Design a protein. Structure first.
Lengths: 78, 245, 15, 107, 92, 95, 101, 78, 103, 89
DNA sequence: GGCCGCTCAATTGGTCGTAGACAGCTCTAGCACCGCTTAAACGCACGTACGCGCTGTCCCCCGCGTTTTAACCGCCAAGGGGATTACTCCCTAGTCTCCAGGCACGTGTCAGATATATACATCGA
DNA sequence: TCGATGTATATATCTGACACGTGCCTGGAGACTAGGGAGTAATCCCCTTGGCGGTTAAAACGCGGGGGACAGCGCGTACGTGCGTTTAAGCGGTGCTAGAGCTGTCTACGACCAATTGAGCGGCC
């Protein structure tokens, strides 16, 4: 049960960076759900790439390829 | 049932015991066909999205295609292709499921209609049956009825090109009187890609009560038909003082 | 009455 | 024999030509690679690199800094509309966002 | 093992567009990702163009078309000019 | 001395947009990745940069979602974001 | 002598019928010639004296109609979300902005 | 100005297919602009493919490829 | 006998194998790659056609038309996710009305 | 060239009493080409990221599990394995 | 109407070469764990800004009605342009040979992070 | 009119990231040939742009009226702000050994391709 580890202030700060002035008290669970779904999709792909290479460790390139596949294309990790 | 015997009816009509004879017909009849618009195939396309009732729900008596029927809400009757088939309660016009009504001679307005049983609100009463005419045939029959000096008129505007005439043929609905404070209303229902008009209750109507609706009467005649609804909001004349073409 | 659809959209023929 | 200068020098480019040529042949993009494809591609890549670095250096001056940091690249990309449309679905690590408050949020 | 990169080339270009400006390792990493990403997109599109026209050789002409399809607005015009200019100097 | 409700919010928006740091704590996020990954393959292992990358993507994705969510809240003639705003944004984005 | 007229359809009820009719059918919603001229006119800004196939224009029409359909489907949600029924230009602008254009 | 050729009821009809019950009177000019921009992007790419192929006619494959690049694959004209 | 019969498939193996080598996907292509790919393509086709046939029957029609393919693809949770960014010519949309629009 | 001839054979095996129009067949032709390019392109990426020069059944399986959703991937992978089994014996 | 041939492409056995799987090994890296700091998260009190449901109004877009217009049918014609057979000649892959450009590791140093009061911008009464 | 807290600010301190440097592989450059891709001519024909007459549906247009877009408001909940308290995230540090990355050898797998063969389309009888 680590999703509660994404604290109320962390969600608040992300929303603040996004420009949100006021947040209702039901946003936290929804955001936790969204983050869980996003991570599940990216991790599923990264783990599949990891299994293919016969490796036990998920590298940064594995996450980059998973993010490239889904149309995020993260720069800074090779 | 009085209208089911032509001989008794005709003699009672001469004696003033019944209204004059017309051909009793169960549905609107078109005298001349018209160019079939692409919408004619609606017999097929208007598939409702109602859930096919299970043997359990149907055995319990649940209302197939009830108030939440997507077709009912749009005033469209289900065809034989409806998911609920013959159990579908949205085929009232096609199954002739009219209400119980009586024809009465009023003290001062002539013939009228009264409810024979208590009718819940938003309940269907009757279809306005008659002959469908075009503008030329309509004007020809107006010129004849004007020649015959007819006091009563039975022309109903169905669509931009179609007027229903209940003067010579029709049903019991032709006796419903005009009220400025009505208890029933008309609705342009769609049946098998064909347009129909029907009367519906606006509130619960107890038995014995006279049935009336707002005619929105397009007075074309030189003279003016006097309004006898008695309500304080009476327009004085059907269609008021304003004469239209 | 559905054979009318063939006039508007023909059936693929493998031969 | 004869001397041997690099194809980048012959093309007048700073980005490599031989490396671009190897990646095309060893990346399975086509069976054959023309002798003008790597030169042209290297020039385009170099131009895009110069175009973004120009904006990055300017952003560095605006923040009174000397080095280029991920934030400067983020500012440079999101403040230029043509590069923005080219990189509108790219996330830059440690880069942040643009200072931006909607006009209805403040009195 | 020796590993592929574009750091030295990005640095050389930086020294030309800004003679007195540095760059950090994180930013350089971003630049390497950017060069590889644009390279993969252009080469992929050129491959797609070569395959659609049933050709086997990717030439400067295909790259030019891929570049014009990939870059938005006036940025494409400048890129195309730089490419043509480079090829011209390479031919002479 | 106290600030009127909203003033510190606007101030927070400025410092976080001005800053370049990560907003989620590292350890809680690091465990979250390991838990979610366990359902796909048991007894995995992660590089440090790999978990960092997932965090960069997650925060960038949430920020991107909140900016677009904010437009929906504003569009509805409101200021406070609500779960329906996120739902609308995700449905329009195509998720 | 007058013609009585029944009650008009309640506004929007016919619109719903049009929604069902068009959603059920599968056909081109834009006139073919006007669309074909539009394709040609804008194409003249990119290359003079072009020529089009019939299947090519059909394809452009399917994509364009599908694009507007997709745009309206997403924009409708926005109008509803604003506690409104009518669609406004601001709704389309919002839909395009959230989509990422 | 053939953009006027995309008639008022055609735009209404497309909105009807999209499930819109009521349309304002400013939607038409906005939709016209949006449609013109969309077509300009697709046509520009399709015409580019045509010029590359040394042709003068725009085939259906040219439109499909331009649409595929925009990220909207179209099935039927392949 | 042909390789399709050996694999117990209906889709061709030669053509898939030919396209992989000719379409520049890698320098080499193995022996199980085209067979596996052909089987996956066939299975997806079968899944589409199965849902298409069912949609045709629920509309009391005996020929698959573009509208039936549209209903089949959009009335499934995962095919919709696979073809969420695809437009089908003459396909239309799924009939649907938001709950605040009905009278 | 098209895949129409093969689509007929598959169609009769899931539905004997049905036909298919030229437009629907065209859609299926596009669908087969699209899924083929997606899988082959993804397999190409998998081989390239691992510095491999050969696309094998393993490569396709990884690409398929990545490209298709869950339950569908389970059915697809089952069919692929069965096919390669009968092909190798 | 059905049988013999062609054009294409699918399959086979073999040579051939080299990509990959196994097996060994090294050492980078991730992991578990301890103890303290000190910033952050948490739970609560408070009151204000806001989301909301109701309300009255205006105006806007509908359904309806009628006319105006050019979009489809369709058929026919001219020929621009696309698709497609042979020639050849140019360009590119390939295999060899050579050497300097580019990458890994190694000092030295200097720009940003840390540390503080100064002095100015912004928001509350 | 003017309380009080933050940001940008100037000054110096401090330090580990930058960047310049040498060493020396390995991969790029030059160079040759054999080969076949595609540039081109030369031809064919088929759909495309173009013409018109002609129908009738859709589009344009103009209207009444009633739905809803909208502004304004009264209510009261709920969220922002600030505090005092709690705790675990963060750091620096410990030590272990999983397994990442690599080099090497050999086995078998696939490209090539000549030859072997039928599938599917077609014409000839």
């Amino acid at each position: 049960d680590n999703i509660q580890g994404i604290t109320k202030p962390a969600i608040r700060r992300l929303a603040r960076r996004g420009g949100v002035k006021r947040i209702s008290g039901l946003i936290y669970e929804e955001t936790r759900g969204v983050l869980k779904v996003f991570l599940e999709n990216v991790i599923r792909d990264a783990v599949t790439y990891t299994e293919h290479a016969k490796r036990k460790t998920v590298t940064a390139m594995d996450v980059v390829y998973a993010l490239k596949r889904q149309g995020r294309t993260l720069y800074g990790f090779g | 049932d009085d209208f089911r015997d032509p001989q008794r009816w005709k003699e009672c009509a001469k004696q003033g015991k019944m209204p004059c004879y017309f051909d009793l017909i169960e549905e609107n009849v078109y005298l001349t066909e018209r160019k079939k618009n692409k919408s004619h195939r609606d017999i097929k396309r208007m598939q409702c999205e109602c859930t096919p009732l299970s043997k359990d729900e149907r055995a319990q008596g649940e209302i197939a295609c009830g108030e939440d029927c997507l077709n009912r809400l749009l005033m469209i009757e289900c065809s034989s292709r409806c998911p609920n088939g013959d159990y579908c309660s949205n085929r009232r016009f096609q199954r002739k499921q009219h209400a119980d009504v009586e024809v009465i001679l009023t003290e001062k307005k002539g013939w009228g209609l009264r409810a024979a049983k208590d009718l819940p609100s938003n309940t269907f009463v009757l279809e306005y049956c008659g002959e469908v005419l075009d503008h030329k045939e309509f004007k020809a029959r107006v010129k004849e009825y004007a020649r015959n000096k007819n006091i009563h008129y039975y022309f109903m505007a169905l669509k931009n090109d179609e007027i229903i005439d209940a003067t010579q043929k029709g049903n019991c609905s032709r006796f419903m009187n005009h009220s400025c404070e009505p208890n029933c209303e008309t609705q342009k229902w769609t049946v098998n890609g064909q347009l129909r008009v029907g009367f519906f209750t606006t509130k619960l109507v107890p038995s014995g009560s006279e049935l009336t609706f707002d005619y929105q009467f397009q007075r074309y005649g030189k003279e003016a038909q006097k309004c006898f609804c008695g309500s304080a909001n009476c327009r004085g004349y059907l269609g008021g003082e304003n004469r239209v073409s | 009455g559905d054979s009318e659809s063939e006039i508007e959209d023909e059936t693929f023929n493998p031969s | 024999r004869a001397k041997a200068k690099t194809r980048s020098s012959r093309a007048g480019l700073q980005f490599p030509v031989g490396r671009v040529h190897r990646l095309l042949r060893k990346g399975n993009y086509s069976e054959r690679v023309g002798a003008g494809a790597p030169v042209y591609l290297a020039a385009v890549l170099e131009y895009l690199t110069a175009e973004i670095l120009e904006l990055a250096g300017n952003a560095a001056r605006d923040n009174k800094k000397t080095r280029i940091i991920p934030r400067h690249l983020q500012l440079a990309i999101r403040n230029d509309e043509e590069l923005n449309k080219l990189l509108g679905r790219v996330t830059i690590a440690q880069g942040g966002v643009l200072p931006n408050i909607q006009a209805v949020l403040l009195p | 093992s020796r590993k592929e990169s574009y750091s030295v080339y990005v640095y050389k270009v930086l020294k030309q567009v800004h003679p007195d400006t540095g760059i950090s390792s994180k930013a350089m990493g971003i630049m390497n990702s950017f060069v590889n990403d644009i390279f993969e997109r252009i080469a992929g599109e050129a491959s797609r163009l070569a395959h659609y026209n049933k050709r086997s050789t990717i030439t400067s002409r295909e790259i030019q078309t891929a570049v014009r399809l990939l870059l938005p607005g006036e940025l494409a015009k400048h890129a195309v000019s730089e490419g043509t200019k480079a090829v011209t100097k390479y031919t002479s | 001395h106290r600030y009127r409700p909203g003033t510190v919010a606007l101030r927070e928006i400025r410092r976080y947009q001005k800053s370049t740091e990560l907003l989620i704590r590292k350890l809680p996020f690091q465990r979250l990745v390991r838990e979610i990954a366990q359902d796909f393959k048991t007894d995995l292992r992660f590089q440090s940069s790999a978990v960092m990358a997932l965090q960069e993507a997650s925060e960038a994705y949430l920020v991107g979602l909140f900016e677009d969510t904010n437009l929906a809240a504003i569009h509805a003639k409101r200021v406070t974001i609500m779960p329906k705003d996120i739902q609308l944004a995700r449905r329009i984005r195509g998720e």
